[PDB]
């Protein structure tokens, strides 16, 4: 029922304004823990030889790499992304150069990804980054993807209930309700705002009084749509484990400047990325995927925020691999 | 201590009475019996029970909005009997979703809302007929009906006074425990924080006020309930030291006190004035006024804070940022 | 433009604010708080001489006089000259103005304090349709003591100085509300009986204990006119006589507990 | 001055403490020790509070707000235009209202009547205490406690409510806001019904015990009674800040996530999850 004192406790607004995490103790220590298992980089190499461009067949991507950094390389995405399968998960044991396997092809395309995610949206990911293993954490699916209707569990790698499943429709409410941190709001805010570009999250008025011709019947927004962007908050705070006052002063949610932190304006940008990845990176990948990996709309798995963040305000308590791996980016 | 203020120490058994109204004494159906443990912290007699027509209206009305909110809610589970119950308090029955102005909305989003809230809203009329003749009938004064009144006014206002006057169904309160409570927050975002309205603001200084008066008055008349204060209508037409006892202590303690029938017309003022001010309040939000913290502001009345982690400005207004 | 919006920076709901506070003023300062007035006013200062006119404030704070048509015959109407006539016996401390009064005499005898009753009718409390409503069990025989709970009859009475004061011989029930209000009792030695309110009745399973008064005291409780109704004065008399002993059956208990 | 019943009750004693030397009235006012230390405590607080007051931004009422100390002074004194000033106001609240109290206990004993209205006076001081104090004590600073304006106490309510998601979820607010509107609503029956018993209209009679109970064993089958909706009233109210407290208190020492998922022990139960 309960959770035991004594709680962690910070400061995001003015004293006397209630502003500020709170956080246990040992759920804290259990994430951190989950996290630690990140591993380290792999030893740096000498750049000796030519680009592997001139030296293997069949390199699109890492072609300005030598040949044992481009290994290097290899080695860590087996170890980000198929650590029990190893190299054959992608490749044929006789043809490197292959493309047979469909993990080869989508590989490349998150090769691509990644390096955009640490280029065009510093915004967002900063000097962090990311690598595979934000995403992966040791398994070629990732363990907290969304498909076009809520899924449960949240974490894939756990087996679901007959109620859980997606075809059992008694249990719709209840993997909705999951993805919204319990509330009954009768909304999904993944397909509504993270999956495309089509919603505006704000609903608030901006100015004191309704404005004529916005304001009567079918001009009106319907009050669904604050329900709406209520349960993607719900769902955005539950993927960072945090709560409102971590980005907002509830005395007016729709203010910026003294009214907002930092993280709000990160928390905008991330909002924009996750829409170009799903947009341009992920949901295209329905091409290359086997059907057992599509969901029930022939719809690709794709990302929210919980797919990196996965209960932490940071990826991995801001562990970092980009001085290790510039080859993952930023790209001049 | 008083220990007749916590509980009858020897309860007391007599002959039914009944007072006799101008019309349905007939209509009082079912025999009266006693419980030893209510008889305890209250009257031991539960029944009869009167039966008019206005109130049998009202079971009929409100039953058959209960059946449309219960059905629609068990649709939602696909009929599993266990998810039923498992999922209840999450279950609801909603408003439209999509705009249709004030169109018929379709069954499958928000007729069946519309219609659960036609009958909801019949059974209260007919509840209020009950309310207010059985007062009538008994020759009593029909306090209690105008504050009833009010009470189904508010209701009206936030089921669909407000929605026709924004022009949009989307806005009425949902049926359903979880999900009333979600519109709460839902409108309270849409109208710039509830807090800023000053109508909220009266309306909970009601509310607050009724705890205070009704603990008040409570304590004070078990205070005087060795005096008989418990007897109200005759301290009003015979004033006995119980009410001038009464009286002196709060005269005593701030400087000023109502009379024993006063007090009541307090009490009544400010359990009226809650609904009252809520309905006030609704009826501006939307027409009137559209985010309740900026026409604060706009007022000079919010206050405000020094920033402590650095002022942030909006990104999107940033050039060259993405929309 | 803008819904609500009125010339020169007004809008509609900043008009309802203005009305909203000049409503709640008006029904609290000219209704509320002159329907309090309707006892007790006017009020009595240090001899009020002006015999010849009144003084302005007076009538203004004052509601019209309404008139309570009552039940078995009769009006009331308030609020109404009700001087408070009997002579109390009462010594001023001090020449201050809210200096308290000291008792000259008993002060449960002399009702003065705790002790005083209000002068109501002396009239008996009536049920709807007549009878008396504060009748003892021997008149009020369709009345019983519910199964479960002590019957008092017969039970002694320990006062406060633990002395068996007398033998509880009634209990009278209220017949319009199904209560009972006091029990009766012979006080031992005295023959004679007096009636205690219930509320100053801790009932034991064999014993009624009564810490208001000490047993010595029990012999000037105020009688009754007749033996098997009582009326409203009556009842106010006998109430008011066991809160005068909360502060005043001993010399300890007037004075500060630390 | 006086009331025309009011001199027979003026009489010595009752205090409990100082006997004779403040066991007097001025004007309707009983004062007694505790009248003296009240008025102190609310002098000094006032004080306080215009000192704080005038070396702030503004003047406007509606945006005056003396605030409690960053978290980080913990439990200790703060610089007194930075939490301190906050600090010492609440003492003589705290000073002010349970003076109030006792003052009233006093006046109780002199009119020999019983002790429950200070007694039920004590459930606002003690719900008080759980905002100000006890729970900034199991936090560990007066940081998490409110900030003294009118309008800037509802920003604290506010974000407070919305570091948990969504408030409404938290088990004991239910019960809390169960028995405000409760309350609220049995006033006006309470208050409505007597008045309608009193004032019939019309010239017509005035009724009686028995047509109260009559009217509500018609309408709703049930009549608690005279005496009982007192009792009954006072319970309520009483209730309204007695399981509230609890919904305040374990929100951040003993839960750290959102309300709504506290209802995971009844969602999650494996028979039919
Ligand atoms: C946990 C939640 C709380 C809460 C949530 C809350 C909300 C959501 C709202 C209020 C509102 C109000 N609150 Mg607040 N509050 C207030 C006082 C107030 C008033 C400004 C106002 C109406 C109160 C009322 O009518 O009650 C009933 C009592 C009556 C009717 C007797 C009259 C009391 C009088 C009107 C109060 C005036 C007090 C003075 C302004 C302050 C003292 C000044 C000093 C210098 C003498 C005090 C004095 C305290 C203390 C000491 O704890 C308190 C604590 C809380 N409030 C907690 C923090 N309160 C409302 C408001 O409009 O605020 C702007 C409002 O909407
Ligand atoms: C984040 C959102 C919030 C919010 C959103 C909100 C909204 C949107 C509205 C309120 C309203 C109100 N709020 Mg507020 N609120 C309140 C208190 C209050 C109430 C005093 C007031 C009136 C509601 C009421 O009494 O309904 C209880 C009584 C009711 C509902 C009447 C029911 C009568 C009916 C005849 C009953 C009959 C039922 C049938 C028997 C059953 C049949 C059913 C079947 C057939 C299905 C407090 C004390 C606080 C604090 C401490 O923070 C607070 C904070 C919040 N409110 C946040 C700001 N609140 C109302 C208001 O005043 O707005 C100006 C309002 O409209
Ligand atoms: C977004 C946030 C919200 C929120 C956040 C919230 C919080 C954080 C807390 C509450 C609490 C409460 N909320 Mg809730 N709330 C409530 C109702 C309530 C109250 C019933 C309850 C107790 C308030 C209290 O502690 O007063 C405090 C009043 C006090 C202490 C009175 C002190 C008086 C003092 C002894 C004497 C003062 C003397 C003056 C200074 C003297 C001046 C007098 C002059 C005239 C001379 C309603 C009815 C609603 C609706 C309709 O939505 C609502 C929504 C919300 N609440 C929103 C969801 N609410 C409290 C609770 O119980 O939670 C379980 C609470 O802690
Ligand atoms: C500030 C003003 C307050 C206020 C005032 C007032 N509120 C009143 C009156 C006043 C003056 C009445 O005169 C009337 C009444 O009659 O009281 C005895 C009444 C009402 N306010 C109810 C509920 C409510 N008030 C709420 C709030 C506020 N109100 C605000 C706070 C809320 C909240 C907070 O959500 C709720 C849920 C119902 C009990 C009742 C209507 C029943 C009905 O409309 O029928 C609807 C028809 C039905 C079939 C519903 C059946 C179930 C219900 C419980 C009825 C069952 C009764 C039946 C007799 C049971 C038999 C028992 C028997 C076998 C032993
Ligand atoms: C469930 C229980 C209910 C309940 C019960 C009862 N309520 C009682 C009694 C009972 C039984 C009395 O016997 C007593 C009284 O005599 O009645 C006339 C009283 C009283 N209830 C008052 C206020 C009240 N009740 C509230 C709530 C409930 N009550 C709940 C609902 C609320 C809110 C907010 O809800 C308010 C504001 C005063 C009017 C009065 C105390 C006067 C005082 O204490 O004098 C002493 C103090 C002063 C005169 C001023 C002191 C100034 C300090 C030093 C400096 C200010 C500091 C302050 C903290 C700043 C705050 C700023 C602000 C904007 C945040
Ligand atoms: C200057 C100096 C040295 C003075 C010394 C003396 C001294 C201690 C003075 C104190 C000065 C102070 C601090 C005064 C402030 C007084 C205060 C706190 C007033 C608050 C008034 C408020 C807002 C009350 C809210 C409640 C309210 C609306 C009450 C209105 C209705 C009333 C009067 C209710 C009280 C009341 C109740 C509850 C009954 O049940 C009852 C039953 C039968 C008869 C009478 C009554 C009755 O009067
Ligand atoms: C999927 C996540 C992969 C795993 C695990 C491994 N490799 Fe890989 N490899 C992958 C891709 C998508 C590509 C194309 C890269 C590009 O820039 O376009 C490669 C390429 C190679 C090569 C070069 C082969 C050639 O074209 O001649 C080699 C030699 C290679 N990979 C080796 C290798 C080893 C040893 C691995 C296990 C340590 C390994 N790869 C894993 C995708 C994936
Ligand atoms: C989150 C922003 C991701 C990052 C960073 C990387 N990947 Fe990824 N990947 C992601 C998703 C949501 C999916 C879809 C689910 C799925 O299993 O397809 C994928 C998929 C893959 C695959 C296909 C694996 C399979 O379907 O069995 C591979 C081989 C893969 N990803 C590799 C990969 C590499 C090498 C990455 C770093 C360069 C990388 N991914 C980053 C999400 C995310
Ligand atoms: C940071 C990681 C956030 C947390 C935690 C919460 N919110 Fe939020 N919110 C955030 C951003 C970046 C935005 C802007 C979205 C955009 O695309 O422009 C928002 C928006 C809102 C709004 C709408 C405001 C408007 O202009 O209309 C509301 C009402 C809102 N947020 C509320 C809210 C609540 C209640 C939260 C806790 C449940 C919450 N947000 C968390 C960033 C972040
Ligand atoms: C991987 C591609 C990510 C996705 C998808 C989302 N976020 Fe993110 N976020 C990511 C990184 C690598 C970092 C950097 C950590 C650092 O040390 O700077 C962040 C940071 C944030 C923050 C800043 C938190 C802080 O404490 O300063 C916020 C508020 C945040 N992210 C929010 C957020 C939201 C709301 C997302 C879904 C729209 C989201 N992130 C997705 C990586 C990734
Ligand atoms: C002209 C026509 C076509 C349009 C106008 C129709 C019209 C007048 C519509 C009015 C609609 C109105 C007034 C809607 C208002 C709805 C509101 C305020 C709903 C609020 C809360 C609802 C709740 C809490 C319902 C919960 C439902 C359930 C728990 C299922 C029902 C079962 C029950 C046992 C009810 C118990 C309720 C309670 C006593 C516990
Ligand atoms: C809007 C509510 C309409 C409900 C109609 C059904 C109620 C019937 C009223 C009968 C009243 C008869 N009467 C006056 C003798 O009590
Ligand atoms: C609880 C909300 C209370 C907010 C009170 C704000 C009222 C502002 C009214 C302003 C009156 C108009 N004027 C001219 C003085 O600005
Ligand atoms: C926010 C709700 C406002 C409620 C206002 C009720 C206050 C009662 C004022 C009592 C005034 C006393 N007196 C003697 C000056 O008339
Ligand atoms: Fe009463």
């Given at each position: 029922c309960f959770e035991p004192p004594p709680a962690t406790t910070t400061q995001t607004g003015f004293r006397g304004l209630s502003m500020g995490e709170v956080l246990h103790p040992a759920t804290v220590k259990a994430k951190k823990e989950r996290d630690a298992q990140?591993?380290?980089?792999?030893?740096?190499?000498?750049?000796?030889?030519?680009?592997?461009?001139?030296?293997?067949?069949?390199?699109?991507?890492?072609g300005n790499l030598t040949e044992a950094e481009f290994l290097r390389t290899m080695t860590a995405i087996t170890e980000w992304v198929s650590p029990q399968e190893g190299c054959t998960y992608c490749h044929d044991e006789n043809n490197l150069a292959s493309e047979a396997k469909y993990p080869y092809?989508?590989?490349?395309?998150?090769?691509?990804?990644?390096?955009?995610?640490?280029?065009?949206?510093?915004?967002?990911?900063?000097?962090?980054?990311?690598?595979?293993?934000?995403?992966?954490?040791?398994?070629?699916?990732?363990?907290?993807?969304?498909?076009?209707?809520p899924t449960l569990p949240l974490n894939n790698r756990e087996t679901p209930t007959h109620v859980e499943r997606v075809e059992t429709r008694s249990g719709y409410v209840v993997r909705l309700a999951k993805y919204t941190a319990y509330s009954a709001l009768n909304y999904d805010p993944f397909t509504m705002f993270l999956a495309n570009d089509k919603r505006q999250v704000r609903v608030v008025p901006q100015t004191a009084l309704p404005l004529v011709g916005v304001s009567r019947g079918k001009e009106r927004r319907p009050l669904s749509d604050a329900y709406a962007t209520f349960a993607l908050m719900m769902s955005i705070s539950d993927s960072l484990g945090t709560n409102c006052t971590f980005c907002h002063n509830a005395q007016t949610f729709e203010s910026w400047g003294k009214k907002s932190t930092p993280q709000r304006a990160i928390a905008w940008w991330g909002i924009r990325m996750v829409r170009d990845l799903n947009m341009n990176y992920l949901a295209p990948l329905n091409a290359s995927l086997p059907a057992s990996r599509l969901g029930r709309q022939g719809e690709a798995p794709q990302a929210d925020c919980r797919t990196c963040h996965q209960g932490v305000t940071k990826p991995l308590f801001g562990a970092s691999r980009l001085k290790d791996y510039p080859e993952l980016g930023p790209i001049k | 201590a008083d220990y007749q203020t916590i509980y009858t120490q020897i309860q007391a058994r007599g002959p039914h009475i009944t007072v006799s109204g101008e019309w349905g004494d007939n209509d009082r159906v079912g025999k009266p019996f006693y419980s030893y443990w209510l008889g305890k912290i209250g009257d031991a007699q539960i029944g009869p029970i009167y039966l008019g027509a206005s109130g049998i209206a009202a079971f009929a009305f409100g039953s058959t909005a209960i059946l449309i909110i219960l059905f629609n809610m068990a649709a939602e589970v696909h009929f599993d009997p266990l998810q039923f119950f498992r999922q209840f308090?999450?279950?609801?029955?909603?408003?439209?979703?999509?705009?249709?102005?004030?169109?018929?909305?379709?069954?499958?989003?928000?007729?069946?809302?519309?219609?659960?809230?036609?009958?909801?809203?019949?059974?209260?009329?007919?509840?209020?007929?009950?309310?207010?003749?059985?007062?009538?009938?008994?020759?009593?004064?029909?306090?209690?009906?105008?504050?009833?009144?009010?009470?189904?006014?508010?209701?009206?206002?936030?089921?669909?006074?407000?929605?026709?006057?924004?022009?949009?169904?989307?806005?009425?309160?949902?049926?359903?425990?979880?999900?009333?409570?979600?519109?709460?927050?839902?409108?309270?975002?849409?109208?710039?924080?509830?807090?800023?309205?000053?109508?909220?603001?009266?309306?909970?200084?009601?509310?607050?006020?009724?705890?205070?008066?009704?603990?008040?008055?409570?304590?004070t008349i078990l205070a005087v309930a060795r005096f008989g204060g418990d007897r109200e209508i005759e301290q009003i037409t015979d004033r006995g030291t119980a009410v001038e006892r009464a009286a002196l202590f709060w005269r005593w303690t701030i400087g000023f006190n109502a009379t024993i029938e006063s007090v009541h017309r307090w009490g009544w003022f400010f359990s009226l004035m809650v609904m009252v001010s809520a309905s006030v309040g609704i009826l501006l939000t939307g027409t009137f006024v559209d985010n309740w913290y900026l026409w604060c502001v706009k007022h000079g009345a919010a206050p405000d804070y020094p920033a402590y982690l650095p002022a942030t400005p909006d990104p999107a207004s940033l050039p060259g940022a993405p929309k | 433009m803008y819904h609500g919006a009125l010339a020169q920076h007004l809008d509609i709901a900043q008009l309802v604010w203005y009305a909203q506070w000049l409503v709640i003023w008006t029904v609290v300062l000219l209704y509320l708080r002159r329907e309090d007035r309707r006892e007790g006013?006017?009020?009595?200062?240090?001899?009020?001489?002006?015999?010849?006119?009144?003084?302005?404030?007076?009538?203004?704070?004052?509601?019209?006089?309404?008139?309570?048509?009552?039940?078995?015959?009769?009006?009331?109407?308030?609020?109404?000259?009700?001087?408070?006539?009997?002579?109390?016996?009462?010594?001023?401390?001090?020449?201050?103005?809210?200096?308290?009064?000291?008792?000259?005499?008993?002060?449960?005898?002399?009702?003065?304090?705790?002790?005083?009753?209000?002068?109501?009718?002396?009239?008996?409390?009536?049920?709807?349709?007549?009878?008396?409503?504060?009748?003892?069990?021997?008149?009020?025989?369709?009345?019983?003591?519910?199964?479960?709970?002590?019957?008092?009859?017969?039970?002694?009475?320990?006062?406060?100085?633990?002395?068996?004061?007398?033998?509880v011989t009634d209990l009278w029930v209220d017949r319009s509300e199904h209560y009972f209000r006091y029990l009766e009792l012979s006080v031992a030695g005295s023959a004679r009986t007096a009636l205690i309110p219930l509320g100053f009745c801790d009932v034991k399973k064999d014993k009624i204990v009564?810490?208001?008064?000490?047993?010595?005291?029990?012999?000037?409780?105020?009688?009754?006119?007749?033996?098997?109704?009582?009326?409203?004065?009556?009842?106010?008399?006998?109430?008011?006589?066991?809160?005068?002993?909360?502060?005043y059956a001993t010399p300890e208990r007037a004075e500060s507990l630390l | 001055a006086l009331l025309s019943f009011e001199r027979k009750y003026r009489v010595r004693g009752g205090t409990l403490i100082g006997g004779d030397l403040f066991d007097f009235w001025v004007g309707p006012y009983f004062v007694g020790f505790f009248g003296v230390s009240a008025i102190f405590f609310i002098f000094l607080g006032v004080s306080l509070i215009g000192y704080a007051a005038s070396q702030g931004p503004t003047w406007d009422p509606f945006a005056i707000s003396i605030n409690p100390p960053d978290l980080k002074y913990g439990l200790g004194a703060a610089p007194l235009l930075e939490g301190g000033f906050w600090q010492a106001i609440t003492v003589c609240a705290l000073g002010a209202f349970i003076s109030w109290m006792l003052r009233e206990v006093e006046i109780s004993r002199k009119l020999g009547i019983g002790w429950h209205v200070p007694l039920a006076f004590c459930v606002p001081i003690f719900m008080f205490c759980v905002l100000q104090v006890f729970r900034p004590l199991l936090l560990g600073s007066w940081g998490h406690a409110f900030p003294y304006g009118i309008l800037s106490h509802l920003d604290w309510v506010?974000?407070?409510?919305?570091?948990?998601?969504?408030?409404?979820?938290?088990?004991?607010?239910?019960?809390?806001?169960?028995?405000?509107?409760?309350?609220?609503?049995?006033?006006?029956?309470?208050?409505?019904?007597?008045?309608?018993?009193?004032?019939?209209?019309?010239?017509?009679?005035?009724?009686?015990?028995?047509?109260?109970?009559?009217?509500?064993?018609?309408?709703?089958?049930?009549?608690?009674?005279?005496?009982?909706?007192?009792?009954?009233?006072?319970?309520?109210?009483?209730?309204?800040?007695?399981?509230?407290?609890?919904?305040?208190?374990?929100?951040?020492?003993?839960?750290?996530?959102?309300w709504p998922e506290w209802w995971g022990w009844w969602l999650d139960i494996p028979f039919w999850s």
């Open positions: 990140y591993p380290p980089a792999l030893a740096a190499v000498k750049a000796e030889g030519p680009p592997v461009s001139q030296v293997y067949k069949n390199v699109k991507v890492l092809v989508v590989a490349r395309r998150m090769l691509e990804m990644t390096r955009a995610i640490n280029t065009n949206w510093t915004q967002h990911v900063a000097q962090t980054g990311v690598t595979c293993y934000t995403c992966h954490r040791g398994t070629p699916l990732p363990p907290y993807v969304r498909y076009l209707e | 308090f999450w279950l609801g029955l909603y408003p439209p979703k999509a705009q249709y102005g004030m169109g018929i909305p379709p069954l499958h989003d928000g007729g069946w809302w519309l219609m659960a809230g036609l009958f909801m809203t019949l059974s209260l009329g007919s509840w209020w007929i009950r309310v207010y003749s059985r007062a009538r009938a008994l020759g009593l004064g029909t306090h209690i009906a105008w504050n009833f009144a009010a009470a189904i006014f508010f209701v009206l206002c936030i089921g669909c006074i407000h929605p026709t006057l924004v022009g949009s169904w989307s806005e009425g309160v949902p049926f359903g425990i979880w999900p009333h409570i979600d519109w709460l927050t839902a409108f309270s975002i849409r109208y710039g924080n509830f807090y800023y309205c000053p109508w909220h603001g009266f309306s909970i200084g009601f509310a607050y006020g009724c705890g205070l008066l009704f603990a008040a008055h409570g304590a | 006013y006017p009020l009595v200062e240090p001899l009020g001489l002006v015999k010849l006119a009144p003084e302005d404030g007076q009538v203004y704070e004052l509601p019209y006089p309404k008139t309570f048509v009552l039940p078995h015959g009769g009006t009331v109407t308030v609020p109404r000259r009700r001087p408070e006539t009997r002579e109390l016996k009462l010594a001023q401390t001090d020449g201050f103005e809210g200096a308290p009064l000291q008792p000259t005499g008993n002060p449960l005898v002399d009702a003065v304090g705790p002790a005083s009753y209000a002068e109501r009718a002396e009239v008996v409390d009536a049920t709807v349709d007549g009878k008396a409503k504060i009748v003892p069990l021997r008149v009020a025989t369709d009345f019983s003591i519910a199964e479960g709970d002590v019957d008092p009859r017969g039970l002694p009475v320990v006062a406060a100085d633990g002395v068996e004061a007398g033998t009564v810490t208001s008064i000490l047993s010595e005291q029990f012999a000037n409780v105020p009688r009754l006119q007749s033996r098997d109704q009582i009326t409203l004065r009556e009842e106010d008399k006998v109430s008011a006589y066991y809160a005068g002993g909360l502060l | 506010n974000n407070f409510g919305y570091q948990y998601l969504n408030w409404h979820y938290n088990p004991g607010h239910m019960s809390s806001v169960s028995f405000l509107f409760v309350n609220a609503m049995a006033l006006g029956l309470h208050g409505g019904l007597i008045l309608s018993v009193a004032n019939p209209g019309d010239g017509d009679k005035v009724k009686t015990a028995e047509h109260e109970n009559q009217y509500f064993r018609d309408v709703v089958g049930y009549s608690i009674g005279a005496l009982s909706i007192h009792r009954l009233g006072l319970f309520l109210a009483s209730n309204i800040f007695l399981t509230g407290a609890f919904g305040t208190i374990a929100s951040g020492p003993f839960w750290t996530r959102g």
